[PDB]
Structure formats: structure tokens, C-alpha cells
């Protein structure tokens, strides 16, 4: 009845949904003059700021991924906001997109970690000088909770997003239904809805930071 | 509590001020709406019927087909304007 | 009917994953009131790191409520 | 004094004259979408005190787009039958 | 396509060659997995 | 500063208004009974379905 | 769960790629320094 | 003036503002000090 | 070798629709044509149920209320913020 | 009725989320006690974050509770 | 009846929560101990805060018990 | 029967509202320890407070279990 | 059908796995509040030591929900 | 057969013995945060005594997972 | 027979008892990490109390685990 909004749309028998995804690309235009208008100066400052903040720890080699990380976070922070609107589609909640955005990165990090620093990357499986009583019962745990990385790295975001849309739909429905009965309950649930809406405006970026930070330090480790 | 009730009394004064500011803007709208206190005159009916017949003249021979677009766009938009009032009457129904 | 009541039960069970969040919430607010009581200066960063955990707990709370609905209304 | 004019300038009689003087190749489709985007941009955005209306339009447009996309699945709950 | 290549291969070259060697492998793995899963579900529904 | 009607339109408007008022009253009258009866007969049908599942539970 | 009607995964993925690794790497690649 | 100029115009007026492409081929073409 | 900009482009009514519309319509009805025009367009959409009402309606209402609150309370602050960044780059270079 | 059974059971076994509220309440009021015993000055700001936690934990409490009363009978 | 069973089942399962009361009061009087043991000049103040938290969480648990009961005597 | 198993499991469930009281006792005692180890001279009052907290948590658990007994013999 | 009602039961039961994660997350970020207030000159390392644990303790409930999904749809 | 039904249900409600590991590890890592703050020159021994704890938390939290997988596949 | 059903249910339920074990163990190691963080002239006695607490908690979980295996392989 309500999983509808997650159904992949095509106004007819044609491939449209690849336009719901590139639309954000032009809410972030590119400048050619030196000085520019507001909407560009603002985002420019924003980005200088966020980079200077997050890419501090990384070493010099690891400082080549700034583009990828900030583009990742910008794209996602756009999508997850835009999806808020009345009748808009969230191309992230299509779990497949999240898997295809998670795996390659994690794998390529691990591969940089095992192409170089072979012995040491192998070593990170054994924390330093642990009791020699339990080695296997530890180098099993580390190596199982490694492969667990991308799976959660995606699913968290996916379901986190989904739940908010579903909850707002349902609360608004029960709002109308109570309006059938009485007046004040409707206002109660409407204020509830305002709160939820703000909270979603928030998580929709919290998760971007989480994502491209997890990745940043996963590169910090296996660089 | 009582202070909130006192704030409500101040809010009531603010609401009176809100009514006070709205009334002159409303008075300007009233100036446009003050033209008729009774139904419209049947004096210009001749002018309107004659303009209608002149439209029919421009139509029958195929001479209005020399118009520019913007004019016809305008005409059709105001036509649809007049039209919406039909559904408005349905609303009354 | 039987599948219906079973959905009901699974829902009433999945409801409970919110306690981790309620705890984490009270916990981190206590931690904040403290770390401010003995350093009222850097309130700003303390509050930032408060809500950043607030979110990472409500996330899982709503994971659980989401699965509850996912079952109840859409299998 | 000109063959090609703004489609508002042209008349209804020569309407097809305009329809046939103009081109239709996909290159001439990109070379139209671009003109639209750039009119909007250089008129409501690229100004030193751009406002909300410099942006709100495209948002409330995308809205109606994704509403039209959805009309089909919404004819199943109209509260009243005979409209 | 000449405008296309001169817009998306002048700047983006040093990235796909020097840095991103290791992500394309991952995308191939991604293709592997998606193939496997679509095949599995196609099989299971071909049954029913 | 009001702008006098180009009388054509002042004519065209209120006529259509009252046309629509009449149309609405007519629709209301003409439509009430059919829906009343279709719904009441559907109520017969739903009572029958109720007794069906009563005996064919 | 309509995220499991696998029919559409190919296009979603390919478009995500096209975007995340082309357009933004064009736009943001042009931003400037203080 | 300033507003009538571009980044290349700054390459023109100030070569010391130049973001050189050798010691820092990548983006943002310099470190984050 | 680049051109400058205006001070502020096409003025706008309700922050959403441009006025040029209104003026283009001035000759025939002058002032109170567009408003009733839109009111009728909308009462029509609603009457025939080209736009059925559901929860998403109120979701849109809430988001829009939030947004207008934000702008009507922070707009000029952000405007001067940005012009400040501009003048600040000008100076820090100049 | 079996659906009645599962309805009552869902209500009961979903009315448990109160644990989050309780635990967070305890933790927050304790953190207050301590941060106050240290510095008796900023009592106002401290009690402010205190009320924040109070109501923000009762928040998830009432979330769970309204879901219970959501699927009690009315669904 | 089957439902008559679910009656008591639920009216019993509806008291799992007082765990919260337990943990709270524990941490509460713990922080109170520490208070009086770090600044004895606050005894009554912090005792009042303690009875506050006590009442609060005890009420949570006991109204959950009222839930249990109203389920019992549905 | 149906009420037999009903009450059985209702009590086997309500008997779990005790772990919280347990952990509460434990934590209040840890707090007592620290407080004393700071100020070894107010032992008496620290202990009075702690034993009170114990009374309360134990009372809560005992009520949650009296529930189970009544379920047994409701 | 009972043979799938049981799947519903099992998944609805296993949902609650992430409560431990809720806890651990809140706890860690409170501890980070504190250890940043004490010696504010180590935010960096004290953050790198927090989200690590966040990852751990989330993984260990996300697994359980993955298992609930598995039980349901396979 | 309802046999397999309750087999499934038992695996599902037996894999719950991991919220322990969750909260335990949370608390452990917070303690490490602090005990590094007040003494930033014992990092090494500190991380070692932290891993000693993380492990024997994860293990006894995972035995429930393993028990569910076992009881399901074989018995 | 359904005896198998109820036995599987009760066993996979009773096996909850390890949550507390994990939680305890974690809190234990946290406290120890602190206590040593401030006071490193105690290593031996510290470690000893640590191991004692670990064993006590692990055993208070082991009881329930072992009796679950009992209920399964015996009754
Ligand atoms: C990292 C840290 C993150 C921190 C986040 C905090 C925010 C960061 C900075 C962003 C602030 C945005 C700046 C801003 O709002 O512009 C004002 C600001 C002021 O402009 P100005 O020309 O100097 O002065 C304008 C006056 O203030 C004008 O004053 P006025 O008196 O004329 O008021 C006009 C108003 C009043 O007129 C009316 O009363 C009309 C009433 C009818 C309402 C319309 C119809 C609604 C129908 C349903 C209503 C039912 C009731 O008209 C409207 O109502 C227009 C609203 C219509 C809806 C359009 C919604 C667009 C919102 C865009 C805001 C962007 C917010 C982004 C925040 C990030 C997400 C949280 O604009 C700028 O100067 C530059 C704008 C820069 C925008 C940056 C955008 C970045 C790219 C984002 C892409 C993603 C889009 C997200 C969409 C969601």
C-alpha cells in the first residue's frame, strides 16, 4: 500500500530513473569568473571548510582522495535532502545503489593495503602483544569483523533513510484519519510531523559524514 | 502561567494591531470592489453585443488570422478565466 | 488469521529494540551535563558531540520500528 | 524584415512558415535546452543579490513533474466517486 | 563525441590511471555478485 | 485604481456563473437517488456476505 | 520489499556510477582556493 | 578591476598565486596547511 | 575580460511567480485578474479531484512552513554573510 | 478470536520500551547530582540540559507507547 | 478460550520494564553517595534531587504495572 | 489446559523484572565503595543511604515477583 | 500458515539485537564528551578511538537483523 | 510441521545474546577513552588490556549466534 | 512432537543469560583500565582482582548456558 514510493518509476516503458539521479548535478554549478554570485561563494566556502577539517589526519599519499570523498558526501547530502519533498524519489533506498557505492571503495582500500605493507596489513589482524593464550580466538574475530565492513557500511544508510519516509507517510495518514474524528489530535500529530521533518533534515547529512568518514579512516589504516 | 496569560493579553493587543495593518490594504481592495452596490447597468449591453458581432465578422471571412500570437494567448487565457466561474457555480451547487 | 496474529506477535517483539537508544540518550546527556559543569567554556563542541550520538542512537531505534511496520503492513 | 522571429512575433497565418523555417535535429534540441537554462540562469541567478525565487522555481517545478509521474496510482482513492 | 572526450578526458585522466586502478577491480567484483544474485532469483522464479 | 471592464467580459461572466449554479442544483437532484439506491443494494449485498461467512466460516 | 525485485539493479547501478565518477569530478574539480 | 577578472587573469597579474601543477598534480593542487 | 552583473534580477511576487505576468495582463483586467485566475485554476483542480489529498499534502505543508520560517528569519543575514566573504576576498587580496 | 489474542499480546510485549526512559532518567539525574556537587553555580543551565534529557527520553517512551496503542485495536 | 490465556500472558509480560527503575535508582543513589562524599554541604539539595529521580522512575515502572493490570482486567 | 500454560508462562515472563533491581544493587554498592574511598569518615551515613537504596530496589523486584505468584494462583 | 507465522515470530524476536548497540553507542559518546572536557588537547585521537568502537558495536546488531531477514525470506 | 516452525523461532530468539557484547564493548571503549586521556604515555599496555577485554566479550557474545546457526542446520 | 518445539523454544530463550556476562565483563575491564591508568604500581593485584571478576561473571552466565544444553540433551 505504501512501499509504492520505493517502486522504481518509468512514466512509460522507457529508462527514466537515470534522470532522478543526475538532477542534483546542477544545484551545484561551477564558476568561471573569479568572483561570482552568492550560491557559489557559499558552497565554495563550505567545501574549503569541510576539507580543511576532515582531511587533516591522513598522510600525504592518502591526501589524493579528497575529490572522491567530498564528491561522495556532496552527492549523498543532496539526494537525501531532495528526497524529502512531497512526491520525490530517494535513489539511495534502492539497496543496490548502496552496495555498488560501498563495495568498490572498501575493496580498493584493502587492495592498497595488501599490495603495499603486506606483512603489516597482515599484522593488523593481530593486535600488538596480546596474550598468547587466545591468538586464534582473536584472529578469527578480527578477520570476520573485517568482511562485515561494506555490508553494514551500506545497510545502515539504506534502512536509516527508508524508515523516515515510511514514518512520515504513516503519521500523516493517521493525521487525516483522526481529523475525521476531531481537531486537536490533528495539530498534535502535525507538530510531531514538524519535529520528524527536522530530524530527517538532520540525519540525511549525519549519514553522509558517517559514510565518508568511515571510508576516510579505513584509508588511514590501510594506506 | 499568569505571566503567560499577561503575554496573551499583549498578544491580543498585537492581534488588534494585525487587524489594524490589514484594513488599509483591504480598503485598497475595497476601492476596486466599491464600483457596484447594485447589479451592473444594461446600458453597455449594446456595445458588448456589437463587439461580439464584430468578432463574428473578423472570424467568418478569415481576417483575424493575421494576428500575432501574444494577443491570441491573452484572449484565450481570459476566456479560460471567464470559464472557471462555471465550475465555481457548480461549487455553489 | 493465524499469520495475522503471528505478524502481530513479531511486531510486539521487535518493538523492544528502542531501549538501547533510550539508555544511550540519558547516558550521553549525563556525560554532557558533567563535561560542562567542570568546563562551561567549550559548550559548543560538547553539544555538537552530544547530538552526533543522539542521532547514532535514534537511527537504530527507528531501524527497529521500521522493521516492525515493514512486517505489519507489508510483510 | 526577417524570416525567423520570436515565436511570439510570428503570426498565425505564417505560423507554419515559422514551424518550417526552424530546425529539429537533436543538436538543435540541445541548442534549445541550453538557451532555456541560460536565460533562467543569467536572469534570476547570476545577479549579485540572488534571492529564493532565483531557486524556488526549479524546486516547485520538479515537484509538479514528480506529481504528474504519479497520477496513475492516485486514481484509486479519490474520496468521492462522481467528480 | 570529440567535445565529449575533450570535456571528460583531459582533466579526469590522471585519476583513472594512477589512483583509481584499484576501484575498477572492485566494480568488476560488484558485477560478479549482481550477476550471481539476479541469476539466482531468475532461477527460483523460473521454478514457480 | 479600478479599471473599467471591457464590457464584453463583464457580460460573459455572471451569465456563466448562474448557468453553473443551475447546473449544480440539477446535478445534485438528478444524482442523489441513483447513488442512494446503489449503496443501499450494496448494503443488502454486504449483509448477505456477512451471513455467508457466518454459515461458511 | 521492492528493493528486491532485482529487475532494475543494472540501470540504477550504472547511473550511480556515471554520476558519482563523472559529473561531480567535473564540477567540484573546478572549485578554487582562498 | 576585480569582478571583471577571472582566475586566469590572476595567473596574469599574480604568478605567485599560481596553483602549480607539478608539485601538486591533484586537487586542490596544494596541501592543507 | 568578463562582463559585470545587475544588482538584482527579475523582481517576483510571492517569491515564486514573476510579475511580468501581471503587467502583460494589465491592459485587459489590470490588477485583479491574475489573482482570481489562479484562485479559479486551483479551485478547479481541487473540485474535479485532479489533486486528491492525502498525508503527503501535510508533509509538503510542514516542509514549506519550515522553509519559509527559515528564510524570512535568516535571509538578509546570509546575504550580508556572502557579500562579506566577497569583500573579504577582495581585501585579503587587495 | 486469535487476532484479539495477538493484539493484546502485542500491546503488552510492546509496552516495554519504557526501560530506555527509566534508565536514561536515572543516569541523567545522577549526572546532575554529581556535576552540581562539584559546582553549585550554574544550576540553571545544568537543570536546563536536565529538562532536555527528561523530555527527550520520555520522547522515545511515548513513541513506543503510541505504537502500542496504534496496533492495540484501531488497526 | 484462547484469548483468555493471552489475557494473563500479556498482563504479565507487561512488567518487563521495571529493569529501568532498577538501573536508574542504582545509579541515582550512587551519584548521591558520591556527592555527599565530595561536598557534604549539599546534603538536602541532592537528597531532594534523589527523591525526584526516585519518584520519576518508580512512577514509570508502576504505570507500566497499571498497563499490566488493565490488560489483566480487560 | 489453556489457563494452566497461560499462567505458567505469564509468571515465567514476569519473573524477569528482577535483573534490573539486581544490577541496581550492584551499582549502588560500587558507588558506596568509591565515595567511602574518598572520605573514610562518613562511613555510617554512606551505609545508611546505601541500605535504603537496597530496600527500595529489593521492594520493586519483590513486587514484580509477587505478581508471578498471583499469576500462579490467580 | 503456521510454517511461516513461525518465521514472523522468529524475526520479530530477533529484531531486538541492536539494543546493546544503542547502549554502547550512547555510552561511548558520553565517555568521549568527558575525556574531551578533561584534556581538550586530544580531540583527534579521542575521536579515532570512539567511532572505531561505534563501528564494532553497530556491526554486532546489524548482523542479527541480517539473520532475521534471512530467516524470513529463505 | 510445526517442528521446523519452532526450530526457526528458537534460532531467532536465541540469537539475542549479543546486545551484551554490544553494551559491554561500548563501555569498554569509553573507559579506554578516559584512561588514555589522563595518562597519554601508557597507550601500549592500555590498548593491550583493552583488546583482552574486547575479545572475551565478543566470544561469549558470539556463542549465541553460533548456537542458532548450529541448532538450525544440525541439532 | 511438539515437545521438541517447546524445548527448542525454552532453550533458545534461556540462552539469553549471556548478555549479562558480556556486559559485566566489559564494565570490569573498563574500570580496570581506568584504575591502572592512574596508578600503575599495582599491576599484579589489579590483574588478580580483574581475573576474579571475569570468572565470576562468566560463570554466572555459564550456569544458564549449561542448563540450556541440559534442557536440550536432557529433560
Ligand atoms: C554545512 C552546514 C549546514 C548548515 C545548514 C544551514 C543553512 C546553510 C546555508 C543555506 C541557507 C540557504 C539560503 C537561503 O535560504 O536563501 C536566502 C538568501 C537571501 O537572498 P536575497 O536575495 O539576498 O534576499 C531574499 C530575501 O530574504 C527574501 O525575503 P522575502 O521577504 O521576499 O521572503 C520571500 C518569501 C515569502 O513570500 C511568501 O510569503 C510566499 C508564500 C507562499 C509560499 C510558496 C507556496 C507554498 C505552497 C504551499 C504553502 C501552504 C501553506 O518567499 C517564499 O516564501 C519562498 C519560499 C518558497 C519555497 C522555496 C523553498 C526553497 C528554499 C531554499 C532555501 C535553501 C535552504 C538550504 C538549507 C539546507 C537544508 C537544511 O539567498 C541568498 O542570498 C543566496 C542563496 C544561497 C542558497 C544556497 C543553496 C546551496 C545549494 C543547496 C542545494 C540543495 C537544495 C536544498 C533544498 C531543500
From TrEMBL, chain B:
<dbReference type="GO" id="GO:0031966">
    <property type="term" value="C:mitochondrial membrane"/>
</dbReference>
<dbReference type="GO" id="GO:0015078">
    <property type="term" value="F:proton transmembrane transporter activity"/>
</dbReference>
<dbReference type="InterPro" id="IPR016702">
    <property type="entry name" value="ATP5MG_metazoa"/>
</dbReference>
<keyword id="KW-0813">Transport</keyword>
<keyword id="KW-0472">Membrane</keyword>
<protein>
    <recommendedName>
        <fullName>ATP synthase F(0) complex subunit g, mitochondrial</fullName>
    </recommendedName>
</protein>
<dbReference type="Pfam" id="PF04718">
    <property type="entry name" value="ATP-synt_G"/>
</dbReference>
<keyword id="KW-0375">Hydrogen ion transport</keyword>
<keyword id="KW-0066">ATP synthesis</keyword>
<comment type="function">
    <text>Subunit g, of the mitochondrial membrane ATP synthase complex (F(1)F(0) ATP synthase or Complex V) that produces ATP from ADP in the presence of a proton gradient across the membrane which is generated by electron transport complexes of the respiratory chain. ATP synthase complex consist of a soluble F(1) head domain - the catalytic core - and a membrane F(1) domain - the membrane proton channel. These two domains are linked by a central stalk rotating inside the F(1) region and a stationary peripheral stalk.</text>
</comment>
<dbReference type="GO" id="GO:0015986">
    <property type="term" value="P:proton motive force-driven ATP synthesis"/>
</dbReference>
<keyword id="KW-0406">Ion transport</keyword>
TrEMBL record, chains C, J, N, O:
<keyword id="KW-0813">Transport</keyword>
<dbReference type="GO" id="GO:0031966">
    <property type="term" value="C:mitochondrial membrane"/>
</dbReference>
<dbReference type="GO" id="GO:0015986">
    <property type="term" value="P:proton motive force-driven ATP synthesis"/>
</dbReference>
<comment type="similarity">
    <text>Belongs to the ATPase C chain family.</text>
</comment>
<protein>
    <recommendedName>
        <fullName>ATP synthase lipid-binding protein</fullName>
    </recommendedName>
</protein>
<feature type="transmembrane region" description="Helical">
    <location>
        <begin position="7"/>
        <end position="34"/>
    </location>
</feature>
<keyword id="KW-0496">Mitochondrion</keyword>
<dbReference type="GO" id="GO:0045259">
    <property type="term" value="C:proton-transporting ATP synthase complex"/>
</dbReference>
<keyword id="KW-0406">Ion transport</keyword>
<feature type="transmembrane region" description="Helical">
    <location>
        <begin position="46"/>
        <end position="74"/>
    </location>
</feature>
<dbReference type="GO" id="GO:0008289">
    <property type="term" value="F:lipid binding"/>
</dbReference>
<dbReference type="GO" id="GO:0033177">
    <property type="term" value="C:proton-transporting two-sector ATPase complex, proton-transporting domain"/>
</dbReference>
UniProtKB/TrEMBL annotation, chain E:
<keyword id="KW-0812">Transmembrane</keyword>
<feature type="transmembrane region" description="Helical">
    <location>
        <begin position="19"/>
        <end position="37"/>
    </location>
</feature>
<keyword id="KW-1133">Transmembrane helix</keyword>
<dbReference type="GO" id="GO:0005739">
    <property type="term" value="C:mitochondrion"/>
</dbReference>
<keyword id="KW-0472">Membrane</keyword>
<protein>
    <submittedName>
        <fullName>ATP synthase membrane subunit j</fullName>
    </submittedName>
</protein>
Automatic annotation (TrEMBL), chain H:
<protein>
    <recommendedName>
        <fullName>ATP synthase peripheral stalk subunit d, mitochondrial</fullName>
    </recommendedName>
</protein>
<comment type="function">
    <text>Subunit d, of the mitochondrial membrane ATP synthase complex (F(1)F(0) ATP synthase or Complex V) that produces ATP from ADP in the presence of a proton gradient across the membrane which is generated by electron transport complexes of the respiratory chain. ATP synthase complex consist of a soluble F(1) head domain - the catalytic core - and a membrane F(1) domain - the membrane proton channel. These two domains are linked by a central stalk rotating inside the F(1) region and a stationary peripheral stalk.</text>
</comment>
<comment type="similarity">
    <text>Belongs to the ATPase d subunit family.</text>
</comment>
Amino acid at each position: 500500500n505504501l512501499f509504492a514510493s520505493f517502486i522504481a518509476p518509468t512514466m512509460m516503458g522507457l529508462p527514466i530513473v537515470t534522470l532522478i539521479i543526475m538532477f542534483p548535478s546542477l544545484l551545484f554549478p561551477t564558476p568561471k569568473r573569479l568572483i561570482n554570485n552568492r550560491t557559489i561563494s557559499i558552497q565554495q566556502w563550505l567545501i574549503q571548510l569541510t576539507s580543511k577539517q576532515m582531511m587533516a589526519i591522513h598522510n600525504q599519499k592518502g591526501q589524493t582522495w579528497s575529490l572522491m570523498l567530498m564528491s561522495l558526501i556532496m552527492f549523498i547530502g543532496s539526494t537525501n535532502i531532495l528526497g524529502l519533498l512531497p512526491h520525490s524519489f530517494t535513489p539511495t533506498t534502492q539497496l543496490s545503489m548502496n552496495l555498488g557505492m560501498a563495495i568498490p571503495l572498501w575493496s580498493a582500500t584493502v587492495f592498497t593495503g595488501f599490495r603495499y605493507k603486506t606483512k603489516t596489513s597482515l599484522a593488523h589482524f593481530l593486535p600488538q602483544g596480546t596474550p598468547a593464550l587466545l591468538i586464534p580466538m582473536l584472529v578469527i574475530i578480527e578477520t570476520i569483523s573485517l568482511f562485515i565492513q561494506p555490508v553494514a557500511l551500506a545497510v545502515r544508510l539504506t534502512a536509516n533513510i527508508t524508515a523516515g519516509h515510511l514514518l512520515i507517510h504513516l503519521i500523516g495518514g493517521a493525521t487525516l484519519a483522526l481529523l475525521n474524528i476531531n481537531t486537536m489530535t490533528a495539530f498534535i500529530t502535525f507538530t510531531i510531523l514538524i519535529l520528524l521533518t527536522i530530524l530527517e533534515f538532520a540525519v540525511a547529512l549525519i549519514q553522509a559524514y558517517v559514510f565518508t568518514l568511515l571510508v576516510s579512516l579505513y584509508l588511514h589504516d590501510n594506506t | 502561567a499568569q505571566f503567560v496569560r499577561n503575554l496573551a493579553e499583549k498578544a491580543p493587543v498585537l492581534v488588534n494591531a494585525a487587524v489594524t495593518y490589514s484594513k488599509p490594504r483591504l480598503a485598497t481592495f475595497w476601492h476596486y470592489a466599491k464600483v457596484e452596490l447594485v447589479p451592473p447597468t444594461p446600458a453597455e449591453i449594446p456595445t458588448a453585443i456589437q463587439s461580439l458581432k464584430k468578432i463574428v465578422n473578423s472570424a467568418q471571412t478569415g481576417s483575424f488570422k493575421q494576428l500575432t500570437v501574444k494577443e491570441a494567448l491573452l484572449n484565450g487565457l481570459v476566456a479560460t478565466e471567464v470559464l472557471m466561474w462555471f465550475y465555481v457555480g457548480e461549487i455553489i451547487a | 488469521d493465524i499469520d495475522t496474529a503471528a505478524k502481530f506477535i513479531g511486531a510486539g517483539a521487535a518493538t523492544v529494540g528502542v531501549a538501547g537508544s533510550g539508555a544511550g540518550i540519558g547516558t550521553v546527556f549525563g556525560s554532557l551535563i558533567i563535561g560542562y559543569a567542570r568546563n562551561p567554556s567549550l559548550k559548543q563542541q560538547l553539544f555538537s558531540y552530544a547530538i552526533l550520538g543522539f542521532a547514532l542512537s535514534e537511527a537504530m531505534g527507528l531501524f527497529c520500528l521500521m522493521v516492525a511496520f515493514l512486517i505489519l503492513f507489508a510483510m | 524584415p526577417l524570416k525567423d522571429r520570436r515565436l511570439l512575433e510570428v503570426k498565425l497565418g505564417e505560423l507554419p512558415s515559422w514551424i518550417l523555417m526552424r530546425d529539429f535535429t537533436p543538436s538543435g534540441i540541445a541548442g534549445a535546452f541550453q538557451r532555456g537554462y541560460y536565460r533562467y540562469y543569467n536572469k534570476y541567478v547570476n545577479v549579485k543579490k540572488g534571492s529564493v525565487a532565483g531557486l524556488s522555481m526549479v524546486l516547485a517545478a520538479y515537484v509538479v513533474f514528480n506529481y504528474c509521474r504519479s497520477y496513475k496510482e492516485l486514481k484509486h482513492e479519490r474520496l468521492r466517486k462522481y467528480h | 563525441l570529440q567535445s565529449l572526450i575533450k570535456n571528460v578526458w583531459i582533466p579526469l585522466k590522471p585519476y583513472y590511471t594512477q589512483v583509481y586502478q584499484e576501484i575498477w577491480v572492485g566494480m568488476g567484483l560488484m558485477g560478479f555478485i549482481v550477476y550471481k544474485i539476479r541469476s539466482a532469483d531468475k532461477r527460483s522464479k523460473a521454478l514457480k | 485604481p479600478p479599471v473599467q471592464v471591457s464590457p464584453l467580459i463583464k457580460l460573459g461572466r455572471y451569465s456563466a456563473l448562474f448557468l453553473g449554479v443551475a447546473y449544480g442544483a440539477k446535478r445534485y437532484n438528478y444524482l442523489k437517488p441513483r447513488a442512494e439506491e446503489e449503496r443501499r443494494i450494496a448494503a443488502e449485498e454486504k449483509k448477505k456476505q456477512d451471513e455467508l461467512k457466518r454459515i461458511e466460516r | 520489499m521492492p528493493q528486491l525485485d532485482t529487475s532494475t539493479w543494472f540501470i540504477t547501478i550504472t547511473s550511480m556510477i556515471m554520476t558519482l565518477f563523472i559529473l561531480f569530478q567535473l564540477k567540484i574539480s573546478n572549485y578554487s582556493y582562498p | 578591476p576585480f569582478d571583471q577578472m577571472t582566475i586566469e587573469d590572476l595567473n596574469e597579474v599574480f604568478p605567485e598565486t599560481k596553483l602549480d601543477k607539478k608539485k601538486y598534480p591533484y586537487w586542490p593542487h596544494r596541501p592543507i596547511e | 575580460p568578463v562582463p559585470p552583473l545587475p544588482e538584482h534580477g527579475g523582481k517576483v511576487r510571492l517569491g515564486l511567480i514573476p510579475e511580468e505576468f501581471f503587467q502583460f495582463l494589465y491592459p485587459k483586467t489590470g490588477v485583479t485578474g491574475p489573482y482570481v485566475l489562479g484562485t479559479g485554476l486551483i479551485l478547479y483542480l481541487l473540485s474535479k479531484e485532479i489533486y486528491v489529498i492525502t498525508a503527503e499534502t501535510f508533509s509538503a505543508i510542514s516542509t514549506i512552513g519550515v522553509l519559509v520560517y527559515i528564510v524570512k528569519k535568516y535571509g538578509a543575514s546570509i546575504g550580508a554573510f556572502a557579500d562579506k566573504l566577497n569583500e573579504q576576498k577582495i581585501a585579503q587580496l587587495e
